[PDB]
Design a protein around this ligand. Structure first.
Ligand SMILES: *[C@H](C)[C@H]1/C(=C/c2[nH]c(/C=C3N=C(/C=C4\NC(=O)C(CC)=C4C)C(C)=C\3CCC(=O)O)c(CCC(=O)O)c2C)NC(=O)[C@@H]1C
Ligand SMILES: CCC1=C(C)/C(=C/C2=NC(=C\c3[nH]c(/C=C4\NC(=O)[C@H](C)[C@H]4CC)c(C)c3CCC(=O)O)/C(CCC(=O)O)=C2C)NC1=O
Ligand SMILES: CCC1=C(C)/C(=C/C2=NC(=C\c3[nH]c(/C=C4\NC(=O)[C@H](C)[C@H]4CC)c(C)c3CCC(=O)O)/C(CCC(=O)O)=C2C)NC1=O
Ligand SMILES: CCC1=C(C)/C(=C/C2=NC(=C\c3[nH]c(/C=C4\NC(=O)[C@H](C)[C@H]4CC)c(C)c3CCC(=O)O)/C(CCC(=O)O)=C2C)NC1=O
Ligand SMILES: CCC1=C(C)/C(=C/C2=NC(=C\c3[nH]c(/C=C4\NC(=O)[C@H](C)[C@H]4CC)c(C)c3CCC(=O)O)/C(CCC(=O)O)=C2C)NC1=O
Ligand SMILES: CCC1=C(C)/C(=C/C2=NC(=C\c3[nH]c(/C=C4\NC(=O)[C@H](C)[C@H]4CC)c(C)c3CCC(=O)O)/C(CCC(=O)O)=C2C)NC1=O
Ligand SMILES: CCC1=C(C)/C(=C/C2=NC(=C\c3[nH]c(/C=C4\NC(=O)[C@H](C)[C@H]4CC)c(C)c3CCC(=O)O)/C(CCC(=O)O)=C2C)NC1=O
Ligand SMILES: CCC1=C(C)/C(=C/C2=NC(=C\c3[nH]c(/C=C4\NC(=O)[C@H](C)[C@H]4CC)c(C)c3CCC(=O)O)/C(CCC(=O)O)=C2C)NC1=O
Ligand SMILES: CCC1=C(C)/C(=C/C2=NC(=C\c3[nH]c(/C=C4\NC(=O)[C@H](C)[C@H]4CC)c(C)c3CCC(=O)O)/C(CCC(=O)O)=C2C)NC1=O
Lengths: 49, 49, 148, 50, 169, 161, 65, 160, 161, 161, 161, 161, 160
């Protein structure tokens, strides 16, 4: 018998990469707002959608 | 062991390297990353500590 | 410093012995000068958190590393790693069958439960359905109703 | 059984451990032994009679 | 970790007594069947990556949804993660076959496996049926190789699927 | 346990101030949405068992959790699962009527994570079941009543995760 | 007190773990108290130590570090 | 089982096992061979039991397979035969264990709540176990049919 | 962490189906709103500190919480409050850009209630501060961009409450 | 609470498989040892009080624990000690009859360490008392029945320590 | 729960010795102080509500804790505060009569810190209230009876802090 | 972590008031007792290992806990016990110097009960060990310094129990 | 610039440039012509920008030119207009580079420490860049004024 347990919160690992995820996580891991050219990368991803 | 299929499909973390050659804001952002990782929150710019 | 939780009980034994000899100074001294910090980070890279996509995880250390890779981790004031690592080998604990939060304080006017939302002190333990708790009789004792 | 109001019959080990093993509520046998408290034998021998 | 010897040692240590007749008989019982465990372990070390694959294909023939759409062994990332998990089960089953005690399985496999699997969405049920497809494969392969007794081979996988098991009885 | 009115009164009382114009506007917003809340609560009280069984038929049926080894395997576990989903729908209806999720973290989300972690209940599968329940009831009561149901369903899923 | 050391430490584990690269052949000021575990650790990883030089010590003192 | 029930019933009473309970366990231990023979009889011919019992059930209660019933369609009839297979498996467990605590403790506690949440008539399920009992006790000797029909009897009794 | 595109792909993949017409229509809706999302994100990145300080000037200033005894009293507590509000505005901008609030309950609303309840942080006062931040940024970026910001601001306030 | 039969059935059911030859062999082993288990249980039910009082006469009598200051000092403590030893012998008999120690960690070893640590009960002295009880009952019922009693007595001593 | 007599008997019994001269002297000290204890207990039973209301009038009235935001604000909280102070005075009277503070840490100070920390009750303000209650009752019953009341009042304040 | 001075300043600051006469009197009391606190801290720093080993020689030696089966059995457990007692004496010295037990429940009594309950450490035996440590150091430093040490030793024993 | 930022952000991540970053660099490469036109607009009329912005600043904030302020006197007002010329030059650099790393990496990091060591009110400097932004966006077409006002906006935001 297992006699103890840790708190298992469900964790969702990223199954693959998309572009807005990639730019948002890049700007996030540096702890800043999205700078102007990040927003341009997102913008020309949107116009090309 | 972790399969490479699990690693390439993952939330890829930015590794901040301190080389002495680097530009000056790069050393600034890397020192910012070290303050964020050790102190768990960015203690400069939010307390000027 | 290392970007992960302690993954064994012997690791917590070893590094608390180091803390006990020489404070925060010798703790950071022993953490930075490992083979682990030198292999993962070397001399140039900042330490980083190693979640379940970065490297191979272990099932024994999982629910507590999930705690540590949060921002509520300086508010878990209860030591989680040593308690789960010590309480893995022992028998079951004295906690309510469902969760460890329903154990009320035994005072005259209750409705005092350690709520999950104020302090994280959560020790879930797998109780089966036919377990019976051990209670102390308030009285002489030999008329403990399991026996008399 | 329809004559008495209830009363607290059982404690958990957490609640009993809370109330009894507090220092003023404590006895002094409860957990390790206590040795016997005799007077010194040289004081007993130095008295004025058996 | 504990083998059978350190299990008997910790059993006799907590009371502070020396070995009696029966402790020497149980130590002789571990030391006599030691060679059998070691040729079984070497025969498993022969075909580990073959046995893991064969048990995986027999499990996927058993439960066919996991290769299909909504299943958890869906993509090749999930397929490779499942086959690496079966490699873990065979590895620590070999370690418990050599040790003769279930403490390596308890300390390094079964403690908190259910937490990770319940969180990630990994099912616990075909995991167990795959563990004992591994057990059945190991059992018939080592019974084919001249070994008379298979109770020690029976031991660790039966323990591992008594522990991941859901008690509903 | 407090609705939008009691929380507004509690904020104005902890201030010690009278009810100013912002509190009046908040109470006017609640008194405009209340009739829609009433009609959605009646429509949800109509179809409790149907919404629950459609949520199980969407998510949990024919998966591994109803097979042997799953935590929804036995008839006792199936009945307790239907019981848990009926609880989630009932308390989401209560939080929709109050317009405040204080009842959810007071009376559902209090020790629910530790209970489910002690029992071995999968939290992701029950989060998917609550999400399918939300999808079914948002198909039932419409767009905006489904949204104001789904905010408390998302509150339950966030506190559970 | 501090040692201005210069060393080169190949990893011999990057092939298995497939990590990215840290530049070896460093020149750093190590504090005197943990210079021991650092020199021992560089010897554990198998790296050669090029140059050890006492930087701030003024060697032969008894107090004042 | 019998040993679990005797141990628990002596366990609440704070006493050891009484000698009458001990010869009860002894008689069950001796009759385990006939129990295993009944279990092999029920296990080896499960295909014909499930097939013939489903045939006689849908002959007897045709409305549940008619459009409008629960078990209408290919996959619904397959799930119906699967539920009958579950109950025959629990019958085999109760035959081996010597008591109905496997059957009750697995598949009879919340059976009403589950089959009400699925929209299933429980009387038609009782008829399914009745036809399973008819085919199974048509398959054995006399005392074997009585001993298996005791557990089949318990399942149909616990339905209604 | 998933945007509208990744959630649509995850639904079609958990189905195992190809992308049918409803998924194409959802992605067309996101690819029409994305330019407005980009321009609102640039306008919010312009005025981070102004929106934060106007939110404090609307709600938290000159009340009891900045007085002695309040939880926003000291300079450390004031700086941490400005930090928390900057976090809420930054993550609301991220959830506006993704078009999905999965980042909010993944990375803001995860242990935030228990942290604030352990510290003694008032949840109603910070909910009013986030509401004033929403009001200021909806005055900044317009009607519909303010609405698609306010849906994630309301998500943060609902998960906090 | 499960015997050898119920644990074998639970393993075969968690597998979802039928009872194969290894399960048949395990049940044949239990059905061969069951008559010896029955006779040893009758012989232990014969001499409950004698085995308990011989265990106290071997270990706990005339030591410090029955003297003043010991935890077995008073008549209340002596009666509770005899009660605890009768519990250990009774549940070891139950675990011998079932052939599985699940009842021991379900109903003896559950909160026993924390109870004894809260009361101040010496765990080493009661472990020696259980060991002497094991020695006496193994002298009573013979070699192999004494061994299959002593495996559950060692289980109780291991869970207590 | 034990007075001076029962604690002396418990010490002599845990020794296993008879009552020697030091125990006789301790019991003579208690049997000399007992009449003063009786008269002080009668005088305190005379003026329970007066001592409680004078303690609130000295410490807690007209401060911030009776104002909005304080923990003594509402009528429910005021009534519970008067109830708590009546408990402290009643149990201090009991510990004065027994001559031993075992009832205080058995039945007041057991879970009181954790209760007050879970509720949000200020411990310093209630310690000041108990100190003012001590000052008032020491003005009531005199110097030495006030001192032997104040030793148990200081025991309650020390266990609370 | 706060001494008597920092707690007085924190009370006067949470009030928002200046330091009135009662705060001046409290600080005068601390500034009179501080020299005695300093000398007792030096005398305790003199004899750390002697006080610890005399506490083990009084309570824990020659009992069951140092015998086989006890939790103080092995050399690892003996060394960890000496380490734990040195921690209790060191932090009691710190709380004596500060004149406030905030460091004790901040840094000793925080997760100590749950740690000891997870490890299987007897809490009553370690409470008796801390009581004997208190008795030895009160024999060392005198009456009143021993009392102001014993108030924090009783704080540690109360938080542990 | 944009290329530096994309290269560094892929460089820490130990990966190549993602295709979204590559079309970001491509779109910046195509918009470089309009960036150079905005740069010529800002460069050729720097005299009128600095003159009119200084006039509107000293009209708006007259205390810094009154005796007692920092920019009081002939050479102090000349140094004030020189600091405004520096910031307009950095605006032109940030317009060409497509990102604010020239502006931040030259004249915005220790701007508070420098202007505190000089005794300068930084809000009046923010007003100087505000008047420069007013004159500059009064000088261009609509999208050109928006693209230049983004960098002017960054400078005034990095002041306070
Ligand atoms: C395969 C037959 C079954 C299956 C497996 C599966 N597992 C995962 C992910 C993980 N599995 C583990 C397991 C272990 N870690 C350990 O340390 C041990 C003991 C040695 C075990 C058994 C862990 C930690 C993970 C997380 C990934 C990681 O290692 O970091 C997946 C991937 C799940 C996903 O979707 O991401 C899969 C598919 N799934 C099945 O369906 C089979 C029943
Ligand atoms: C069925 C599973 C089960 C067990 C085992 C159990 C034990 C148990 N033993 C107890 C006490 C006790 N147990 C002992 C026993 C001992 N102390 C010694 O010194 C000896 C070494 C040892 C006996 C061999 C004593 C002396 C007490 C009384 C403690 C007291 O009254 O202070 C108590 C305290 C309440 C009461 O007496 O009635 C419980 C609950 N409860 C259970 O539900
Ligand atoms: C989304 C991209 C993607 C693909 C395609 C994928 C394929 C994939 N093909 C598999 C097997 C297989 N695939 C094939 C056949 C073929 N394979 C081919 O690509 C040919 C078209 C064809 C032969 C002409 C066969 C015969 C097997 C069974 C292999 C075995 O027995 O292990 C398996 C092992 C599980 C299974 O039995 O299905 C995976 C995961 N995984 C992915 O993530
Ligand atoms: C009112 C607030 C509240 C909730 C929600 C609550 C839940 C709760 N759910 C339980 C069990 C359960 N809950 C589930 C539910 C699930 N397992 C699955 O596989 C599915 C994913 C999921 C259903 C959608 C199951 C199967 C059990 C039974 C576990 C068992 O019997 O072993 C138990 C165990 C005790 C008992 O069944 O009666 C509790 C206390 N209790 C409460 O007081
Ligand atoms: C071992 C104890 C046990 C039982 C009994 C059990 C029943 C069970 N029956 C189900 C469905 C079902 N069972 C039936 C069965 C019937 N309908 C009829 O008309 C006939 C009278 C009858 C069978 C002869 C049908 C039609 C469904 C499908 C219900 C639906 O699709 O809505 C389902 C949901 C789908 C699934 O995961 O299988 C469960 C869990 N599960 C268990 O673990
Ligand atoms: C104990 C540590 C502490 C400090 C310092 C503190 C400051 C503080 N100063 C404020 C306002 C202010 N403080 C000033 C003060 C000044 N402006 C000037 O021009 C002068 C140079 C200077 C004072 C001589 C002004 C003008 C405001 C109002 C700001 C506004 O209304 O926008 C406010 C917001 C309103 C309020 O709740 O009081 C806080 C919290 N709070 C604290 O807890
Ligand atoms: C990115 C997701 C995320 C959030 C939101 C987060 C919040 C967070 N806010 C905190 C504190 C705080 N948060 C506040 C904020 C407030 N108190 C008030 O009175 C106001 C009503 C409200 C501001 C509007 C204050 C005052 C503190 C400091 C508490 C203290 O120092 O005692 C802390 C305590 C540790 C520390 O300050 O650095 C955390 C972890 N952490 C995270 O990872
Ligand atoms: C006999 C031993 C014993 C004590 C002492 C005891 C105290 C106790 N005091 C309580 C509440 C309380 N106690 C106080 C008292 C105070 N708050 C303040 O601001 C003042 C400083 C202080 C009074 C001097 C208040 C205001 C509450 C109510 C808390 C609430 O309703 O939220 C509660 C909460 C439940 C209830 O009110 O009925 C308990 C159990 N219980 C016991 O069994
Ligand atoms: C490219 C980045 C950059 C900047 C910004 C910079 C500023 C700078 N401004 C200076 C002086 C100054 N700058 C000002 C400017 C102002 N005072 C006011 O009242 C107005 C609000 C404001 C201008 C509109 C004044 C008055 C001085 C003289 C300070 C003194 O003489 O003490 C000086 C010292 C003298 C010198 O060597 O020029 C430096 C280095 N240097 C740089 O490399």
């Amino acid at each position: 018998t297992i006699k103890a347990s840790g708190g298992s919160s469900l964790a969702r690992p990223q199954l693959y990469q998309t572009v807005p995820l990639s730019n948002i996580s890049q700007a996030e891991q540096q702890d800043r707002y999205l700078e102007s050219g990040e927003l341009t990368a997102l913008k020309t991803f949107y116009d090309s959608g | 062991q972790l399969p490479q299929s699990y690693f390439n499909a993952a939330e890829k973390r930015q590794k901040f390297v301190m080389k002495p050659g680097l530009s000056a804001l790069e050393k600034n952002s890397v020192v910012k990353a070290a303050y964020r990782q050790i102190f768990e929150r960015d203690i400069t710019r939010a307390y000027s500590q | 410093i290392l970007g992960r939780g302690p993954s064994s009980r012997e690791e917590v034994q070893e590094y608390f012995a180091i803390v006990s000899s020489g404070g925060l100074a010798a703790l950071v001294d022993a953490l930075v000068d490992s083979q682990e910090y030198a292999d993962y980070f070397g001399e140039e890279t900042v330490p980083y958190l190693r979640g379940l996509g970065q490297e191979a995880q272990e099932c024994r250390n999982w629910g507590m590393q999930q705690d540590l890779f949060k921002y509520s981790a300086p508010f878990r004031k209860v030591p989680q790693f040593i308690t789960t690592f010590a309480s893995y080998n022992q028998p079951l604990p004295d906690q309510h069958v469902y969760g460890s939060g329903n154990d009320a304080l035994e005072i005259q006017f209750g409705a005092i439960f350690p709520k999950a939302t104020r302090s994280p002190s959560a020790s879930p333990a797998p109780f089966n359905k036919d377990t019976r708790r051990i209670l102390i009789h308030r009285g002489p004792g030999i008329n403990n109703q399991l026996g008399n | 059984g329809e004559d008495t109001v209830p009363y607290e019959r059982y404690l958990t080990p957490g609640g009993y451990s809370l109330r009894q093993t507090r220092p003023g509520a404590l006895r002094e046998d409860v957990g390790v032994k206590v040795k016997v408290e005799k007077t010194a034998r040289f004081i007993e021998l130095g008295t004025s009679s058996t | 970790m504990r083998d059978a010897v350190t299990s008997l040692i910790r059993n006799y240590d907590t009371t502070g007594r020396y070995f009696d007749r029966d402790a020497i008989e149980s130590l002789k019982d571990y030391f006599a069947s030691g060679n059998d465990r070691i040729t079984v372990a070497a025969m498993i070390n022969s075909q580990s990556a073959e046995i893991v694959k064969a048990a995986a294909n027999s499990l996927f023939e058993a439960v066919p949804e996991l290769l299909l759409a909504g299943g958890n062994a869906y993509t090749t990332r999930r397929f490779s993660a499942c086959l690496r998990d079966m490699d873990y089960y065979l590895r620590y089953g070999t370690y418990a076959l050599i040790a003769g005690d279930m403490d390596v399985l308890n300390e390094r496999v079964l403690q908190g496996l259910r937490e990770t699997y319940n969180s990630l969405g990994v099912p616990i049920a075909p995991t167990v049926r795959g563990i004992q497809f591994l057990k059945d494969a190991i059992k018939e392969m080592a019974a084919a190789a001249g070994i008379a007794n298979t109770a020690f081979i029976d031991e660790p996988f039966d323990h591992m699927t008594r522990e991941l098991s859901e008690v509903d009885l | 346990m407090q609705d939008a009115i009691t929380s507004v009164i509690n904020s104005a009382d902890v201030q010690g101030k009278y009810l100013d114009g912002s509190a009046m506007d908040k109470l006017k917003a609640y008194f405009t949405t209340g009739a829609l809340r009433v009609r959605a609560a009646s429509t949800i009280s109509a179809n409790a068992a149907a919404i629950v069984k459609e949520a199980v038929a969407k998510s949990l049926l024919y998966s591994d959790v109803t097979r042997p080894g799953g935590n929804m395997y036995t008839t006792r576990r199936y009945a307790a699962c239907i019981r848990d989903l009926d609880y989630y729908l009932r308390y989401a209806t209560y939080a929709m009527l109050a317009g405040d999720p204080s009842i959810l973290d007071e009376r559902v989300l209090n020790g629910l994570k530790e209970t489910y972690n002690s029992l071995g209940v999968p939290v992701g599968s029950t989060v998917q079941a609550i999400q399918a329940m939300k999808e079914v009831t948002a198909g039932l009561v419409g767009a905006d009543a489904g949204r104001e149901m789904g905010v408390y369903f998302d509150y339950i899923c966030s506190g559970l995760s | 007190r501090m040692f201005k050391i210069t060393a080169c430490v190949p990893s011999q584990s990057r092939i298995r773990t497939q990590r990215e690269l840290q530049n070896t052949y460093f020149t750093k000021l190590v504090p005197y108290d943990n210079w021991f575990r650092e020199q021992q650790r560089i010897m554990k990883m198998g790296g050669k130590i090029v140059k050890v030089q006492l930087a701030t010590g003024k060697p032969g003192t008894n107090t004042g570090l | 089982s019998i040993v679990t029930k005797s141990i628990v019933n002596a366990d609440a009473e704070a006493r050891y096992l009484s000698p009458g309970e001990l010869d009860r366990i002894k008689a069950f231990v001796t009759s385990g061979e006939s129990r295993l023979r009944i279990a092999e009889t029920l296990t080896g011919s499960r295909e014909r039991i499930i097939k013939s019992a489903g045939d006689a059930l849908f002959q007897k209660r045709p409305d549940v397979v008619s459009p409008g019933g629960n078990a209408y369609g290919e996959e619904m009839t397959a799930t119906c035969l699967r539920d009958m297979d579950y109950y025959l498996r629990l019958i085999t467990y109760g035959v081996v264990a010597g008591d109905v605590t496997p059957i009750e403790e697995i598949g009879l506690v919340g059976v009403r709540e589950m089959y009400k949440s699925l929209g299933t008539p429980v009387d038609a399920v009782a008829q399914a176990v009745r036809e399973m009992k008819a085919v199974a006790t048509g398959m054995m000797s006399g005392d074997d049919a009585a001993e298996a029909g005791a557990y089949f009897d318990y399942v149909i009794g616990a339905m209604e």
